[PDB]
């Protein structure tokens, strides 16, 4: 896993996944309460019923992160225009990953016409604020006060959210697929392994999609009931691929005693994301492991006297190592318990440095 | 001391000394009890008195290891022939060093005519038997059933005691000096640093000199009282040079709490003679430090979990190191506490490997 043939240490990481699967997404809007009528879009119009009570017509948020059977799908649906959605009213889908992940992409399978405008936000820590990841809209400048298909200029801020209309046309009344790719278009993505900026940009504990506006044909110009019952959001699969974040100090994440997902921190690191050196392993500062060298926390010396030490920066600057031992057993002094305390000596058979 | 410029470890040893100085030698015979009369040898004969009570005529064993003032001396004296000494009766002088030394030489300053025959024995450990170091006699074969001036043949037993008459002639009625040199004449003395045989041959906790026979002029052929009172043993200084044994793992010996002399064991060794690895430092076997490489006990790993380990030979054979850790704290397993016990993992913030 996190070590080579000879057994030397080396950078690792869990395998790529879709952190969404199983995760019960939360949506603000969900047709079915109370029962209402929707009508697929085309003439003709084969209308049906969104009903929460019956298991054959339910369309909860749940149908977003369940298995994807290309044969017959499962989707979540919004109340129809008639219920008062369209715009400015919006609908939200929040994916709670419960643990920081290194996100690569967020792809959506729309069971109806993709939205006219929608954005996709993320938090880097369950504390932190909702950050704009990407904006999709046929009216970027007007809807998101943002350029049509802006590109990130070199040198410029690698973390701004862009906007495009490329995915907002209605064209495919169904199967409308949308895919967000974090490092896509970031002038540094090549040097990613040494771009803290991007290394954080891909970081994410939670992801959110905001349906801001429905794409429309024009029929709803005159409040015809039968037409409104024809426009709504419907998603057949919410998939976000990336891999559990561990900084290259683990190759597998696992739920613990408290049922919260975490990293199996190798390289002598610990912490939820293996972002820190286990105490005692403070010979040098903690680092993300690269391909070049798989940074790993090195142990203190102490010579067995102390089982505890802190990281002394000055010591580190002077000598190569900076692991400073604390409270050395057997009246043995020194930065790494390597000497007898003044006026004490090592005298035969007795294990501890004894007085004069 | 026991480390070079850069501070790397290196072979050391206390400084050369005369382990005899101050040490109260013990002699079986000592004129003065009761008062008797001795007469220096030449005619004339200026006789005097050996008396225990008066401090101006006492000649205790003590005058053997006291400072040597070339101006006026101090010596220990035996009862005169008349008291019944000569031969076969012998007299003994036992130097108790109280701590194993690496002996180079034993030299004697005789205040009278050196003995006709005497040997010098040593023990390598206060337990062990009295071993013959050297034999001096004008009649080697007859007195010590040993060759006149035998030499050690190459390949042969490097530890046998030789004999010579070279120092038993009476010639100098006084100032007769005799010097024993351990490595002298030993075909291996050149390669000494890699000759356990010789390395032990020079080892010695105690030294003993045996006065077997007095050299005589012939006058005592007829029991004349005045002549017998003229023959006796008298030594002006007993000096044994060498250095406190520590195997090159110390550069100074010091008396401890119990007032018994010992080594200040560096190189991570301990024991009275630094002949063994402090527990925990069992990555490899203990060794005497040579000039080539200053063998030093290397520490076990354990990764801070255990503060105790034993030396596993098999481990040592398989991998370079063989320090095997015992009872690893924090349910952490492995030869050097480098892994979570089966069905246990390293999960964030918690220091110990916790269950599934
Ligand atoms: C659906 O997702 C969007 C995106 O986060 C949520 O909208 C956000 O809602 C909060 C509170 O309603 C807004 O915060 C407010 O910000 C303004 C100015 O920044 C400030 O004056 C307020 O004190 C407050 O902090 C946030 O701006 C807003 N984001 C955007 C761009 O609309 C929305 O709440 C989610 N669905 C829900 C729960 O309705
Ligand atoms: C002065 O130094 C000499 C040298 O050690 C002492 O002589 C040794 O004395 C012991 C006991 O008197 C002898 O041990 C005996 O050995 C024989 C055979 O090896 C054995 O039959 C006995 O059971 C016992 O073990 C030892 O041989 C002898 N050494 C020699 C070569 O004479 C002497 O005792 C010292 N001065 C004293 C205390 O009289
Ligand atoms: C959701 O969680 C349950 C229980 O942990 C699990 O059995 C189920 O497979 C999960 N659903 C998905 C989409 O994997
Ligand atoms: C003998 O021991 C005493 C007390 O330790 C010391 O003062 C004295 O100098 C010693 N004698 C010699 C010969 O050094
Ligand atoms: Ca689905
Ligand atoms: Ca003297």
Residue numbers in the entry:
A (entry chain A), B (entry chain A): 37 to 78, 83 to 396
What does the publication say?
The diffraction limit of the trigonal crystals was limited to ∼3.8 Å in the c* direction, but extended beyond 3.2 Å in the directions normal to c*. A significant difference between the laminin β1 and γ1 structures is the presence of a calcium ion in the γ1 LN domain. The calcium ion is bound at the C-terminus of a short α-helix and co-ordinated by the side chains of Asp106 and Thr114, as well as three main chain carbonyl oxygens assume that the co-ordination shell is completed by water molecules bridging to the side chains of Asn108 and/or Asp277. An equivalent calcium site is present in netrins G1 and G2, but in these proteins there is a direct bond to the metal ion from a glutamic acid replacing Asn108 of laminin β1. Equilibrium dialysis and dot blot experiments with proteolytic laminin-111 fragments suggested the presence of a calcium binding site in the γ1 chain, and little calcium binding to the α1 and β1 chains. This result is entirely consistent with our crystal structures, which show a calcium site only in the γ1 domain. Furthermore, the partial co-ordination shell of this calcium ion is consistent with the relatively high dissociation constant of 55 µM determined by equilibrium dialysis. The calcium-binding loop in the γ1 LN domain does not contribute to the conserved patch on the β6-β3-β8 sheet, but it is adjacent to it. Whether the calcium ion bound to the γ1 LN domain is responsible for the calcium-dependence of laminin polymerisation remains to be seen. The conserved patch in the γ1 and γ3 chains includes less of the top surface of the LN domain, but is otherwise very similar to that of the β chain subfamily.
